[PDB]
Amino acid sequence: VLSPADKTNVKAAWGKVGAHAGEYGAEALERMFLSFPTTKTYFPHFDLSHGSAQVKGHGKKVADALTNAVAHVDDMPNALSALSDLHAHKLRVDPVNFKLLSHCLLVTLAAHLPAEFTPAVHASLDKFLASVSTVLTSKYR
């Protein structure tokens, strides 16, 4: 459950990402592929080499989705409807993977927001990414 304070923390933090969102999303992915190699089984069609065009493109897409999520924090199920559908019926990514990407997103943020990444904001972002993950896998079964 995101409290009013969680929501403020997230908006602040994400406000700071601003224009770098796509660059951070690409970085988070690369961090995921390297640290949790099993996540690569979902991207057999991608060039996972460092700086790959598919990765950069995909990273922008993921980032934009998160940006939207932040913008509609109070209406996530509706905001992310197209993605919930897509993941649930086509992609079919096992739910454990979401926890892996979330961690790599948190690490990325931490490496880039020295001032903002306080323990309270860290807790808010962890909670926010868990909520996004829950929405995206809500139609699996």
Partner 1 sequence: MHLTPEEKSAVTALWGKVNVDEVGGEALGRLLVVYPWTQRFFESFGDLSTPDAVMGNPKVKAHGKKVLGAFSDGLAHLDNLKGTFATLSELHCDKLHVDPENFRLLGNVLVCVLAHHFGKEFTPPVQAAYQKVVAGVANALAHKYH
* CA–CA separation, 14 and 67 (whole Å): 7
Known binder of ligand: residue 58? Answer: yes
Looking only at residues 40 through 59 of this chain, which bind partner 1 when binding is defined by CB under 8 A? 41-42, 44
Nearer to a copy of itself, 48 or 106 (CB): 106
CB 29 within 8 A of CB 55: yes
> Which one of residues 1, 19, 82, 115 is an interface residue with a copy of itself (CB under 8 A)?
1
Nearer to ligand HEM, 115 or 119 (CB): 119
Known binder of ligand: residue 87? Answer: yes
Give the tokens for residue 26. 């690409």
* CA–CA separation, 104 and 98 (whole Å): 10
Binding-site residues sit at 58, 87
